[PDB]
Each structure stands twice: as structure tokens, then as C-alpha cells.
């Protein structure tokens, strides 16, 4: 395969939200194999940024996803042409995102471009007034629809006041070649940043995937 | 614990789907501690059911999951007293149901009544016209919120022709007494209709439920 | 017709807000063909109602509307045989209601059994806590789906301190018998409390509604 | 008042719809408060496109909008320093819309710099397989939310071979200096491509908007 034990990431995100404009380039590697990968970001413009970056990063490649054999891995197969992907997310509070990527792979490097689009968030929101802590750990539910593959999520992110404020995410993942298509099954996430500094000018961010079937009989 | 290893399970259901009414009743068992279940329903009113019975099945008790230690049971703590739930679920092509159920506890057996109610299915889609196989094994979110928990679930149907059918549930889950709150936490299930005659008159139901925290280690 | 120019309405609603279990019975009367109605409601099980009254008015009959004669009356047109209807209401803050209602019509006098049902409310949310002072006025966007009439409002609850809170309806109306469809229109609305007494258990409620087209005029050459 | 009987309009969308990227640049005239305008739009990249033009329509500014004297104009208000907007468009069927538009006056012409993002629309449905005959005509509700103005609106597209296909459209107002807040009331509208040719590459596309009271006592 084109995809080897250890990969490196580039990317860069444009994007607005509540209007705000801003561009975000990274860098990273991760283990496509293992389901793991740390990246370090970077804010090109638009600083300081108004609003909590958590909303950020889950836009910043389910490539890295610990996929067991008898679970068809869409993403990996996918390559050496790549796939692409579609979003929405759905806040509790009447903020809604839009996000795309386009997912190229390039000698041993991924390149990511990425839009990102957020609007209606409340003013005096979680995430207009950075209350954010974290998401909590998720399960991601996949399953095919017209050809390609779908991921709804339900996600949550833990507020600094105490108590949970909810987004559900709905994804269209799209190969760019015919690929082994799974059964329903489950990705299970953790995304965490691991540190930053002020205004989130720098971050980095790692994230563990595993994909299973129902631990129940 | 007034929650023994074997239960009983009594229940009523009446409700509505497509303004059409009908009532159900059931008898079953399980295994609290080890997230089992078993029950017999019977259409009592409303035969035979022009919907598919599969948006009925998650109606018919969260004291049936296994729960580790380490993770407080906001079900079987509340016990005797017992508990209530209040859900909506909301299909992907504008069905909506809401359900709520009161769970109470003499001797041996709980006993549920509860109300279900179904508007706004499209006449020519899957829940009218009976294309479901079985929900799919899922992942539920449980998070307490305004001193009691809640749980929400990316529910979905297996259809007859290939291809889901999606359907978002949240609940509310009121204790009846005080109870230690749990942090942030999951419920995997796997709901099953073991056997049923022609137009679901009777079936057979099995639910098997486990709480947990994320299996990825922490860091 | 069996539609008269002054008709009575009798009705028993039985439903639960947040598991709490009510029931109330209403009479009035209402003037089909100039789309007013005025009724009185007693809370008969479920004293004092713990949830805001406002929530409920809307399920207390499009028959009471008044139609122009280039648009068919889907509702008027439904009698004698009658009809039903079927309504979700999915509030911002994540309260749902369901609410059913079969309407009949006997001599001079239309019976409805509505069902209502409410989940999911926010123990300090305005339903809860009572802080709703009316619905404001609305317009209903009526379209046939699948052989039947949809209507979709975006309402919204003035509040106390100010402000709105607002609820999306989604409501599927059902003839007993083949009519004539309309082509898309609109359906406007004014639902008022008129009087009510401490704790809501007699209240007089009042609905004005009338059908158009687009008040704007069509493109032309 | 800056705002005249007649003025122009000048603008530019980017965006994306399905992963496809496209640039239109448009110009017009209206008559503020009369509330009606034409304008005429071009595909500069992204030709041809590949779904249904109407879901661009309503991007392409409520200061035209014939607004009665007892109630108070949040958009003529708003000038000389202008207004941006925000807007989400949930369609029934899953598709998902962002749109955001920077509006400014210089001399007797309106700019707006517009960003629309479309995802998750069904390959099969009305918009990738351009079925939409035309929006019906809308009554907009209209209400101050943490001291902007908020609008929503029921719409529907009128689809090929009879039918309907619903869109929910939430959109936040933000004048960019302080003025006089409205009471709850409606925007009545009727949107219109007037002409356009073949794939849509030169569209006309008119508007009349009136703001008003309940009808009813
Ligand atoms: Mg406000």
C-alpha cells in the first residue's frame, strides 16, 4: 500500500464564523494503522480568534482509524486518489458549521484544504465566549447511503461552568474510487488538545480512532 | 438491593401512530445486573398494526444494564421508589414519536406505563409500509443536565431493500428520590425481536445493554 | 353544506406535559366562513396545571378559517364525513410536543378528542416555570404532501422579561374523504387568551384566521 | 438619508456546493423603499453548474424592503456604515447551507462580498438533479435576539412534476452601529429568476419584499 506504518500531515483551513474570518495552516504525523496522530496548528490570520477553537478540531482524516480486518476500511483503500468529505454540525443553540476537505496524499505527506463556515452562534454562547474545556470521548455510527460512506455522531463538549452543550455531526465521506464498502459499524473517537498558548495561536492536537462492531453478542 | 439478580418485568402501553390507536400489553424477565431481558407483548387494541412494529420496541427500562463500579447506576439506585423517562424521537423523514414511561416496583416485578405517540410518517415510507428488519446495535450518551441524566442515540433501522433508516432519540430519566449523578458515560445496546407471529400480535423481545467509559486509553 | 354560518364545538383533550397527566373540556361556538371562534376551557383532572397554559391553546380546527373562492377549503370540503389531524411542535430548547385530533361533526356541533403529549422541557425553561405571555400572530404555509394537506408555522412565545421563544409546528391534516387540493397558500393566524382565572382552570380563548395567496403581486410581461 | 429612491447594487459570491467550488459576480438596481430590485449575475468560475441555481437565489439585502413608518427599519437605519448577515438553510432531506454577506454603501451603490457553502446534499435529490421549478413566495418572522435581529422563514420550492421540497432558513441581522430595535413583525417576499440561459451562466433575478403587521385584529 501507499500507506505506511508512519505518515505526515499538511493542511490548511480558511474559514469564518459568526463572520469572523481566519486561516489556519498545520503540520503533523500520525500512525495510520494504530488509529493515532498529533498535529501542531498554526493561525495565519484572523487573530486573536473570538470563539472557542473546539469547534475547530475535528475538521482538522478518518485514514487515521485502527480498522480490524473483517471491517472493510474505506478510507485507506481510498488511496493512492484520496477521498474527500462533507459536514454539518448542529449545536444545541442554533449554531450550525459547515465544513469540507479535500484529503490528497503526496509521496509520504497527506494534504488537507479545508473550509469551515459557522454561523447564528449566540453572542454570549459557549462558543462565542470561550467556555469551552473539551469534547468528551464519542462513538461515531457509519453506514452507507447512495454509494457512499455516512457518519453521524452525537458530541459533546464540556463547559468550564460544569454541564455538557451538544452538537450532532453529520458527515459524507467520498471516496474518489470504487472501494470495499462496510457494514454498519462504529468509530470509536478521542481528540484532545494536548497544549496551546495564548488566543490558541498555537495548538496541538492529538486524536485516537478505533473502529469495532457492537461489543455485544 | 430491592433489585435482585432475577426480575420481573409487567407493563401497558397505549398509544397512537398515524392517529391509529392501539394498546399492548406485556409480561417478561431479566437479569438487572447483567443488562438481560426477555418479554412477551400482546396487541390488546388496535389489531393488526398498519406500522411497523420496530418503532415500538425501545418503548417497552435502563435498570436492565450491566454497570461497572466505578460508574454510579442512576436506575437501580432510585429504587424502590423507581424512576421516569420522557423521549422524543425524531425519524429522518419528519416522523415524530414521543414516549414517556413511569417504572415502578412491587416484590419481584417492575411495571411500566407507558404512552407512545407517532405523527407526520409519510404514507409510502418505511414505517407505513412496513420495510424495517431491525435497529441496528448503538451507542447511547449519557450526560447529566439540570440535576438529572440524560441520554441521546444515533438510532437506525436496517430496511428490507438494503440501506438505513435514521432516527434521533433524547430522553430525560427523572429519579424519584436522590441519587449519586454519574459523569459523562455510555450505554452500548443491542435490541432484538426474537420471534413474532404474521402481524405482530405476539412477539418475543430482547434487549442487551452494558455501561461503560470511552475504551481508548486516557492522555 | 353542513357547514353552517354559526356552529358550537364541544372537546376533551387528555395528555401529559413533563409525565404530568391532565385533562380539560371545552364548549364554544365560532362563525366558520369569517374564520373566528371563541370557546371555554375547565381543567378537569390535573389541578393547578403545573406547565404554561400557552402550549395547549393551538391544539384547541382549520374548518374555522375563512377561505377566499380561488382557494379550495380543504377543511370545509372534508364534511359531513370530517377529518384529522396530526401536529409535532419541536420548541428551541428541545421540548417536543405531539398532539392528535379527530374532529366530528354531529347536527350543528363539531366534537374533538385531542391527544397532547409533552417531553423533554427544561425544568427552568419558560414552559416549566411559566413565563409565556401569548403566542404571537403567525402565517402557516399550507402545501399537499403525499395526497394530504402539510401546514408548517414558525411560532413564537412572547415572554416576560422580554424577548421570544420560538417553536417550529409541522402539522399533517387528513380529509375522510376524496376533496379538491388547494395549490400552495397561506394561512394566517391570531390566537388570544381572553381571560383566564388564577391558575388557568377556566379560560376563554379566542382564534382569528384567514386564508390568501401572496399579498404581492405576481410577475408579469 | 444616504439611502435614495434609487440605488445599484454590485457584488461577488464564492463558494461551494457538494465539494464544487464557483465565483458569481453580479449587478443591479432597486428602489429601497419600494422594496423591489433586478439585478443580473454571472458565472465567473465553476461554469457549468452542477445544481440547482435556485438554492443561491436568496444570497444574492433587506434594506429593499418597502418597511411602514410604525415600524422601525433595522436595515436603512443601519447605513452609512452598513450590516452583515449570517444565515443557515436546513433543507428536508439533509442538504445543509451557510451563507454570510458583508454589506457596505459607496455613493449610490451597495456592495456585498457573499460566501455561500452547501453539504450533505443527496446525489439523487432535487438540487444535484436541478428539479426546482422556483421558491414560492414567504412570509419571513422577524424578532430581536440578543440584540440583533433574527428572521425566520419557512420556504419551499416548487419541484418539477408537482410538489414541494422544504427549506427552514435562519438568518441573523447585524448593523455594524447601534439602532432603533423592531418589534416582532413579518417580511413578505417574492423571489424570481425572470431569465437566465443555458446551465445558468447569465441569470436575472428580481425580488419584492414588504414589511408589515399581522393582517388580523
Ligand atoms: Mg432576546
Same mark, same amino acid.
Given at each position: 500500500?501507499?500507506?505506511?506504518?508512519?505518515?505526515?500531515?499538511?493542511?490548511?483551513?480558511?474559514?469564518?464564523?459568526?463572520?469572523?474570518?481566519?486561516?489556519?495552516?498545520?503540520?503533523?504525523?500520525?500512525?495510520?494503522?494504530?488509529?493515532?496522530?498529533?498535529?501542531?496548528?498554526?493561525?495565519?490570520?484572523?487573530?486573536?480568534?473570538?470563539?472557542?477553537?473546539?469547534?475547530?478540531?475535528?475538521?482538522?482524516?478518518?485514514?487515521?482509524?485502527?480498522?480490524?480486518?473483517?471491517?472493510?476500511?474505506?478510507?485507506?483503500?481510498?488511496? +493512492?486518489?484520496?477521498?474527500?468529505?462533507?459536514?454539518?454540525?448542529?449545536?444545541?443553540?442554533?449554531?450550525?458549521?459547515?465544513?469540507?476537505?479535500?484529503?490528497?496524499?503526496?509521496?509520504?505527506?497527506?494534504?488537507?484544504?479545508?473550509?469551515?463556515?459557522?454561523?447564528?452562534?449566540?453572542?454570549?454562547? +459557549?462558543?462565542?465566549?470561550?467556555?469551552?474545556?473539551?469534547?468528551? +470521548?464519542?462513538?461515531?455510527?457509519?453506514?452507507?447511503?447512495?454509494?457512499?460512506?455516512?457518519?453521524?455522531?452525537?458530541?459533546?463538549?464540556?463547559?468550564?461552568?460544569?454541564?455538557?452543550?451538544?452538537?450532532?455531526?453529520?458527515?459524507?465521506?467520498?471516496?474518489?474510487?470504487?472501494?470495499?464498502? +462496510?457494514?454498519?459499524?462504529?468509530?470509536?473517537?478521542?481528540?484532545?488538545?494536548?497544549?496551546?498558548?495564548?488566543?490558541?495561536?498555537?495548538?496541538?492536537?492529538?486524536?485516537?480512532?478505533?473502529?469495532?462492531?457492537?461489543?455485544?453478542?
Amino acid at each position: 500500500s501507499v500507506i505506511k506504518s508512519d505518515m505526515k500531515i499538511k493542511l490548511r483551513m480558511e474559514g469564518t464564523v459568526n463572520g469572523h474570518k481566519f486561516v489556519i495552516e498545520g503540520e503533523g504525523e500520525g500512525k495510520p494503522y494504530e488509529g493515532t496522530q498529533t498535529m501542531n496548528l498554526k493561525v495565519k490570520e484572523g487573530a486573536p480568534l473570538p470563539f472557542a477553537y473546539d469547534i475547530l478540531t475535528t475538521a482538522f482524516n478518518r485514514v487515521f482509524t485502527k480498522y480490524p480486518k473483517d471491517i472493510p476500511d474505506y478510507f485507506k483503500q481510498s488511496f +493512492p486518489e484520496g477521498y474527500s468529505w462533507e459536514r454539518s454540525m448542529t449545536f444545541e443553540d442554533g449554531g450550525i458549521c459547515t465544513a469540507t476537505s479535500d484529503i490528497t496524499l503526496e509521496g509520504d505527506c497527506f494534504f488537507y484544504e479545508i473550509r469551515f463556515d459557522g454561523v447564528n452562534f449566540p453572542p454570549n454562547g +459557549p462558543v462565542m465566549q470561550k467556555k469551552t474545556l473539551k469534547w468528551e +470521548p464519542s462513538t461515531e455510527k457509519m453506514y452507507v447511503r447512495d454509494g457512499v460512506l455516512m457518519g453521524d455522531v452525537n458530541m459533546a463538549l464540556l463547559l468550564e461552568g460544569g454541564g455538557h452543550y451538544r452538537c450532532d455531526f453529520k458527515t459524507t465521506y467520498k471516496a474518489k474510487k470504487g472501494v470495499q464498502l +462496510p457494514d454498519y459499524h462504529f468509530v470509536d473517537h478521542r481528540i484532545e488538545i494536548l497544549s496551546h498558548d495564548k488566543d490558541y495561536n498555537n495548538v496541538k492536537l492529538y486524536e485516537h480512532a478505533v473502529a469495532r462492531s457492537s461489543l455485544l453478542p
